[PDB]
Amino acid sequence: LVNNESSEVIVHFTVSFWLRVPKVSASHLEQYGTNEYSIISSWSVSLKGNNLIWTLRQITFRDLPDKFNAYLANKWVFITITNDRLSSANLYINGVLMGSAEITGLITLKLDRCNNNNQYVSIDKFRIFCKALNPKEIEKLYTSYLSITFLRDFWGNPLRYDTEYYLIPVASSSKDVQLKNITDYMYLTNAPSYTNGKLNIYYRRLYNGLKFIIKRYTSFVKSGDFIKLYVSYNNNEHIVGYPKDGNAFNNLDRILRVGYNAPGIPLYKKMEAVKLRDLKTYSVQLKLYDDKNASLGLVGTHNGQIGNDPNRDILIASNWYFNHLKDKILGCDWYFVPTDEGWTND
Amino acid sequence: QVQLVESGGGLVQAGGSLRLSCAASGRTFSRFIMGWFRQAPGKEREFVAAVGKSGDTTYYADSMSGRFAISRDNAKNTVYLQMISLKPEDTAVYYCAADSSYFYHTHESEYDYWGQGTQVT
Amino acid sequence: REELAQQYEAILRECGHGRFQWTLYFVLGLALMADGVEVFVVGFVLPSAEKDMCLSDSNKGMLGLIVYLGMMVGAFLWGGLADRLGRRQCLLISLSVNSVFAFFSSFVQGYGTFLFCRLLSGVGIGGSIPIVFSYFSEFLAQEKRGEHLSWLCMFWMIGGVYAAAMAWAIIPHYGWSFHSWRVFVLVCAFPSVFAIGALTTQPESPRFFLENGKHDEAWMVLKQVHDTNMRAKGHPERVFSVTHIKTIGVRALSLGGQVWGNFLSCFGPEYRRITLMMMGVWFTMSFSYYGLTVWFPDMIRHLQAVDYAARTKVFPGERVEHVTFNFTLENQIHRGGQYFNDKFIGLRLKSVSFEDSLFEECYFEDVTSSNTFFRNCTFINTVFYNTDLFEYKFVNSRLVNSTFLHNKEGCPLDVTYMVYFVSFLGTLAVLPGNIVSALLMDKIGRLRMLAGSSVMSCVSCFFLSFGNSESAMIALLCLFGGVSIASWNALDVLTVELYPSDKRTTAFGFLNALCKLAAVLGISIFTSFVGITKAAPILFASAALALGSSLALKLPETRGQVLQ
Ligand SMILES: *[C@@H]1O[C@H](CO[C@@H]2O[C@@H](C)[C@@H](O)[C@@H](O)[C@@H]2O)[C@@H](O[C@@H]2O[C@H](CO)[C@@H](O)[C@H](O)[C@H]2NC(C)=O)[C@H](O)[C@H]1NC(C)=O
Ligand SMILES: C=CCCCCCCCCCO[C@@H]1O[C@H](CO)[C@@H](O[C@H]2O[C@H](CO)[C@@H](O)[C@H](O)[C@H]2O)[C@H](O)[C@H]1O
Ligand SMILES: *[C@@H]1O[C@H](CO)[C@@H](O[C@@H]2O[C@H](CO)[C@@H](O)[C@H](O)[C@H]2NC(C)=O)[C@H](O)[C@H]1NC(C)=O
Ligand SMILES: *[C@@H]1O[C@H](CO)[C@@H](O)[C@H](O)[C@H]1NC(C)=O
Ligand SMILES: CC[C@@H](C(N)=O)N1CCCC1=O
């Protein structure tokens, strides 16, 4: 839905739907911070600054200060707003109760009362149940919509081949991936960050580092598929892979190499894109096979010192991660963050 | 005692450019924070600009960044103050001072030595 | 001269080794312990005293070398004076000077007066080895003397470990406040006090009296030594039937002439070759030993610095607006940042650098920086209230409309546990070498043991390149220290047995002064090798020890012979 007089949807308890609110700029937030514009009205749903409001009694949920993990950022989220007339109303985001109000004693989908021409919010899967959902129902609903039919990028959109992506480790999100030299290793580095105390918002710049590509071995990325990963560098694609009998940490944490070209040596460049853990998050795990169909191990990182270079986090493809799939946080998960017009660094 | 003398003044047409050279004496010259002060008719001395003990860092007063440029040459044992876009307001006697302290200072009391001063119309 | 020695050897050979020799061993090991403590006092104190006393690198070097210069002067002075006046009296005077000036060195504030006090303390302690080894050589028979003098050097390491332990247990209490290191110096000045406390209760050596034609005093001293030993030996009944031994402003000029004559007689026709060979041996061994022992810790520190540099982390492209920070940072680099309208209150920094940043309308307050710099930074309308940011902390920066207010006071200089542990390890690693040398000096021989230890050290020097890690340097230093000590024990035993009794303290003292002089030059040369090829110290220390070994082999033999 765009801020246009011709962009409307008209249709002739509880309410659920998917929402994607593009991030608000610092200047826009400073100027249009108090103006309230609604998105779905009948009760009503409106957005004011970094606040999502439910209008009946009223409810106001404040977005988290960290825009990287915030809900009103460019990411897709699931909103459930229970309305139990007998007792109260409870609001769930991604099957999480973020608040509620005591409503005791008490369809148009378009941007109304908005003075910004760049305000556009996407709404999908609008449903209106005839009762009040409990925690189990909300959990079931959120699980029902998310599946393993296809991988997803950072914003929730399905992955596509022939598209530039930025890889961001899930465990350590404040680091970017850099390449030392051609036919050499890649290491993680700190990423530039933005912080504003007056507006109480901060995050990390999301468009620096290596630019990768996922290409067919031989138009959406499907789970458990065989792919070749190329790194764009100076307007040229460099294949990613682990050369035969290459250097590694502890003899088993094989260190991957980019654009490796050594005559008389074989280079493994077959990977499998899979989603093995955290079905509720948008992360991708990559396996790196060999020419004999063996599994070298999922792509990860290890801390060490290669030569005289300073101690860093070297991208490796170790097989150790398969033994700790039950861990709360694992270092084998990445975010593919393609450039999007709903996120611009302040 | 370091002896300072300034030269390079002289009447300048409006909007012109001019340079002043402040030459010191004695081996001990890299141990002072050089400065430049000016005294307009009827006003007290006002700090204008200053340069560090190695010529790397500069220290400009309010509104003096852009018209005044200060630099020092350790080899020749001298200091340069380049002025451009001179207006009638910039009529004064520009003094050259030396400070032995380890901090940048604008007050005239803190500065130890002084120069004879030269007239710039 | 040769007839008197034969008789004197018989008196000690008949009476035997009793309580007197052991008592003297302990009350002289106390003085050697005092020397071993005094050698490390300035070394352990520089890191802590560098802040209070406003010391620079040149001052650190001068403080390092002042102790050796003082010892150099003192060795010659007390060695010369001991022959004319005696051994007990000159040892008392030298140690009293040491204790007094070491005590006055703790309540000193200025740097120049501290340097003067340490110099005079070194002058006082310089006369320990010459007088101690000589004065104890005259109570030992030729049946077993090389062994007995070797155990006498076991107290130097006792002094070293005492100093290291006190440094570990007193210095780190930084919160005492006069700070702790002064209390450490005061504690380290006690062994000299015990030395005077014990030494006043022992007699003057008989030999000095016999050589000065004061045979009655020698007779009574030998009577005392006989009585003390017979009081608790197997046979206490035998009476000292030995009769008398064979008889053979102005004062300032007389002593000056006598000391000069004694020193010159060492270069006579009969003691020319011996003196030259001993000069060469002492010089070369001292050079290599001090060069390596001061070179190892510097290499360890250099490797630690390299590791610290390798541990640094970078933070590029940070933008901040309207935020307050009060959290400490250490070993970080911030490049290309933009800060507007921020505040920094109670900030502490250590080895933190800021490059290509930009500060506008900021405000600093109570910030202390150590090894912190601003490179290519720009400041606009920034306020510095009560800050330690000196002029040199900004490199290639530009300040516009900024101001410093209520600037902190203190030392303008920028430089405002492992050492103790390494020093303790070396001082303990010198033990087995001492034990083997003591047990085998009289069996193998002075000359053979000296040559073997010197060549072994020269060969072991070649394995310096084999160790590159921090752990390897400690093992290499321990190996070198533990195997080279026998060379010095053999040299101390050899220098005593060569010269006659009339010159032994002058001759030993002159050569000890040369030892300290060579130590200073070796320290100065070896400290600059760091940052250069590793083969240079190997070559220098190998050539020096080789020259020492050849000259040492060319000396004569002294085993099994009366101490003439
Ligand atoms: C150059 O700086 C002066 C001084 O800044 C003020 O005093 C400092 C010590 C510190 O407290 C700053 O925050 C202060 O602003 C500026 O003079 C002030 O300008 C402001 C502008 O809003 C004005 O409100 C104040 O009254 C002024 N103070 C005085 C004493 O006159 C000056 O504006 C700066 N110049 C430029 C070109 O930016
Ligand atoms: C003399 C002065 C030298 C100049 C010093 C400049 C140093 C720049 C400091 C950059 C650090 O910026 C700071 O990083 C942390 C994350 O690590 C951010 O996030 C933090 O914000 C809040 C502040 O408590 C909290 O939520 C958390 O602590 C953290 O999320 C801060 O919002 C940001 O303000
Ligand atoms: C000091 O920092 C400035 C930036 O503040 C550097 O100049 C920039 O250099 C980059 C890289 O070439 C250019 O893209 C920018 O346009 C430059 N900025 C300006 C304002 O000129 C400068 O090179 C740095 N100096 C040193 C010695 O490192
Ligand atoms: C820094 O400020 C925070 C926030 O007020 C406070 O909790 C903390 O104790 C402060 N630190 C110090 C060392 O005063
Ligand atoms: C010069 C005196 C000699 C000793 N035996 O006391 N030594 C050996 C260790 C270092 C030293 O000075």
Which residue, chain included where needed, has tokens 């193998």? C444
Distance between first and last Cα of chain C: 7
Q: Is position C175 within any domain?
A: yes
Q: Are C74 and C22 in contact (CB under 8 A)?
A: no
C124 contact partners, CB below 8 Å, separation of at least 6? C70, C74, C94, C95, C96, C97, C98, C99, C100, C101, C102, C192
* Residues A252, A136 within the same domain: no
State both tokens at A344: 């611009």
CATH code of the domain containing A218: 2.80.10.50
What does chain A come to in residues?
346
Q: Is B57 close to C399, i.e. CB distance below 8 A?
A: yes
How does DSSP classify residue B115? B
Q: Are C181 and C45 in contact (CB under 8 A)?
A: yes
Q: Ligand 1, atom 6: nearest CA belongs to which residue?
A: C381
Q: Are C304 and C323 in contact (CB under 8 A)?
A: no
Q: Is position C387 within any domain?
A: yes
Bridge-based pairing of strands A267-268 and A248-249 is unpaired
C489 backbone dihedrals φ, ψ, rounded to 5°: -65, -45
Q: Is A190 close to C315, i.e. CB distance below 8 A?
A: yes
- Quick one: which of C389, C440, C436 has its CA closest to C410? C389
CA distances from C558 to A122, C266, C508 (A): 104, 18, 16
Distance between first and last Cα of chain A: 24
Domain boundary among C148, C172, C201: C201
Q: Which amino acid is at C183?
A: V
The helices-and-strands tally (H runs, E runs) of chain C is: 21, 15
Alpha-carbon gap, residue B40 to A190, rounded angstroms: 52
CA distances from A275 to A150, A208, C257, C455 (A): 9, 25, 99, 69
Please give the sequence-ordered ranges of beta strands (E in DSSP) within A118-247, or none if there are none: 122-129, 167-169, 175-179, 186-190, 193-196, 201-204, 211-216, 225-232, 237-243
State both tokens at C81: 């004076």
C356 pocket-lining for ligand 3 (C-beta < 6 Å): yes
- What sign has the CA pseudo-torsion C137, C138, C140, C145? positive
C381 pocket-lining for ligand 1 (C-beta < 6 Å): yes
> Which string of DSSP letters, residue by residue, matches A271-340?
EEEE--S-TTS--BEEEEE-TTS-EEEEEEEEEE--TTSPPEEEEEE-SGGGG-TT-SS-TT-EEE----
Q: Is C321 close to A196, i.e. CB distance below 8 A?
A: yes
Alpha-carbon gap, residue B54 to B56, rounded angstroms: 6
Indicate which atom in ligand 1 lies nearest the CA of residue C403: 9
Alpha-carbon gap, residue C454 to C549, rounded angstroms: 6
Q: How many CB atoms neighbour CB A317 within 10 A?
A: 26
Chain B with chain C: Cβ pairs closer than 8 A: 46
* Residues A239, A135 within the same domain: no
Alpha-carbon gap, residue C202 to C205, rounded angstroms: 9
A and B touching (3 or more beta-carbon pairs closer than 8 Å): no
The CA-based angle A173-A176-A178, given to 5 degrees, is 155
Please enumerate residues of B whose Cβ is less than 8 A from a Cβ of C: 33, 52-54, 56-62, 65, 102-106
- Quick one: which of B9, B10, B92 has its CA closest to B44? B92
* Chain A interface includes C327 (CB < 8 A): no
The CB-side HSE value for C527 (13 A sphere, CA atoms) comes to 13
Alpha-carbon gap, residue C537 to C545, rounded angstroms: 12
Angle between helices C129-137 and C57-85 (to 10 degrees): 30
Domain boundary among C350, C379, C405: C405
Q: Are B6 and B117 in contact (CB under 8 A)?
A: yes
Q: Is position C456 within any domain?
A: no
Alpha-carbon gap, residue A76 to C122, rounded angstroms: 79
Domain boundary among A145, A178, A193: A145
* Residues A53, A182 within the same domain: no
* Residues C183, C323 within the same domain: no
In this complex, the residue of C390, C398, C401 whose CB is nearest that of residue B103 is C390
Q: What is the residue range of C330's domain?
A: 312-405
* Residues C328, C196 within the same domain: no
> Which residues, listed in sequence order, are joined to residue C335 by a DSSP beta bridge?
C316, C355
Alpha-carbon gap, residue A107 to C460, rounded angstroms: 92
Alpha-carbon gap, residue A331 to A300, rounded angstroms: 6
3-state secondary structure of C70: helix
- Quick one: which of A289, A240, A290, A245 has its CA closest to A261? A240
C318 pocket-lining for ligand 2 (C-beta < 6 Å): yes
CA distances from A206 to A176, A190, C224 (A): 9, 12, 93
Alpha-carbon gap, residue C212 to C276, rounded angstroms: 28
* Residues A62, A30 within the same domain: yes
Q: Are C299 and C473 in contact (CB under 8 A)?
A: yes
CA distances from B14 to A2, B87, B90, C111, C279 (A): 58, 6, 10, 58, 81
3-state secondary structure of C517: helix
Alpha-carbon gap, residue C509 to C278, rounded angstroms: 12
Q: Are B38 and B92 in contact (CB under 8 A)?
A: yes
Indicate which atom in ligand 3 lies nearest the CA of residue C356: 2
CATH code of the domain containing C333: 2.160.20.80
3-state secondary structure of A201: strand
* Residues A36, A175 within the same domain: no
The CA-based angle B38-B39-B42, given to 5 degrees, is 155
Q: What is the residue range of A84's domain?
A: 14-145
* Residues A244, A120 within the same domain: no
* Residues A175, A312 within the same domain: yes
C343 backbone dihedrals φ, ψ, rounded to 5°: -135, 145
Count of domains for chain C: 2
3-state secondary structure of C228: helix
Backbone dihedral region of A327: left (phi > 0), alpha (psi from -120 to 50 degrees) or beta? beta
- For chain A, give percent helix, strand, coil, nearest 5: 5, 40, 50
Q: Are C198 and C99 in contact (CB under 8 A)?
A: no
- What sign has the CA pseudo-torsion A106, A111, A116, A119? positive
Distance between first and last Cα of chain B: 30
Q: Is A197 close to C313, i.e. CB distance below 8 A?
A: no
> Which string of DSSP letters, residue by residue, matches C246-304?
P---HHHHHHHHHHHHHHHHTTSSSSHHHHHHHHHHHHHHHHHHHHHHHHHHHHHHHHH
State both tokens at B28: 């001990």
Report the side by side order of strands in the sheet with A77-83: A97-101, A89-93, A77-83, A14-20, A122-129
Q: Is position A171 within any domain?
A: yes
C481 backbone dihedrals φ, ψ, rounded to 5°: -65, -40
> Which residues, listed in sequence order, are joined to residue A10 by a DSSP beta bridge?
A108
Give the domains, in start order, of chain B with CATH numbers: 5-101 (2.60.40.10)
What does chain B come to in residues?
121
> Which residues, listed in sequence order, are joined to residue A284 by a DSSP beta bridge?
A334
* Residues A202, A171 within the same domain: yes
Q: Which amino acid is at C468?
A: N
Q: Are A213 and A228 in contact (CB under 8 A)?
A: no
Count of domains for chain A: 2
The helix (run of H) or strand (run of E) holding residue C88 is helix C88-104
Alpha-carbon gap, residue A116 to A104, rounded angstroms: 35
Q: Is A192 close to C319, i.e. CB distance below 8 A?
A: yes
C129 pocket-lining for ligand 5 (C-beta < 6 Å): yes
- For chain B, give percent helix, strand, coil, nearest 5: 0, 45, 55
* Residues A70, A140 within the same domain: yes
Alpha-carbon gap, residue A29 to A46, rounded angstroms: 16
The CB-side HSE value for A200 (13 A sphere, CA atoms) comes to 9
CATH code of the domain containing A140: 2.60.120.200
Q: Is position A4 within any domain?
A: no
Alpha-carbon gap, residue C470 to C305, rounded angstroms: 11
* Residues A136, A230 within the same domain: no
Alpha-carbon gap, residue B105 to A163, rounded angstroms: 57
State both tokens at C181: 């290191």
Q: Which amino acid is at C106?
A: S
C203 backbone dihedrals φ, ψ, rounded to 5°: -85, 165
For C134-167, letters b (16+ CB in 10 Å) and e give bbbbbbbbbeebbbbbbbbbbbbbbbbbbbbebb
- Quick one: which of C563, C485, C503 has its CA closest to C156? C485
Q: Of C373, C374, C376, C380, which is best to mutate to test ligand 3, by the most ligand atoms within 8 angstroms of its C-beta?
A: C376
The CB-side HSE value for A337 (13 A sphere, CA atoms) comes to 25
Alpha-carbon gap, residue C437 to C323, rounded angstroms: 69
C405 pocket-lining for ligand 1 (C-beta < 6 Å): no
Q: Which residues of B touch C412 (CB under 8 A)?
A: 102
State both tokens at C99: 């204790």
Q: Is position A155 within any domain?
A: no
Q: Is position A150 within any domain?
A: no
- Quick one: which of C301, C300, C303, C302 has its CA closest to C476? C300
Q: How many CB atoms neighbour CB B12 within 10 A?
A: 14
The helices-and-strands tally (H runs, E runs) of chain A is: 2, 27
Alpha-carbon gap, residue A278 to A213, rounded angstroms: 23
Q: Are C203 and C221 in contact (CB under 8 A)?
A: yes
C555 contact partners, CB below 8 Å, separation of at least 6? C274, C277, C278, C281, C447, C494, C498
* Residues A79, A195 within the same domain: no
Q: Are C366 and C388 in contact (CB under 8 A)?
A: no
* Residues A29, A176 within the same domain: no
> Which string of DSSP letters, residue by residue, matches C89-138?
HHHHHHHHHHHHHHHHTTS--SHHHHHHHHHHHHHHHHTSHHHHHHHHHT
The helix (run of H) or strand (run of E) holding residue A20 is strand A14-20
C-alpha R_g of chain B: 13
Backbone dihedral region of C549: left (phi > 0), alpha (psi from -120 to 50 degrees) or beta? alpha
Alpha-carbon gap, residue A216 to A157, rounded angstroms: 19
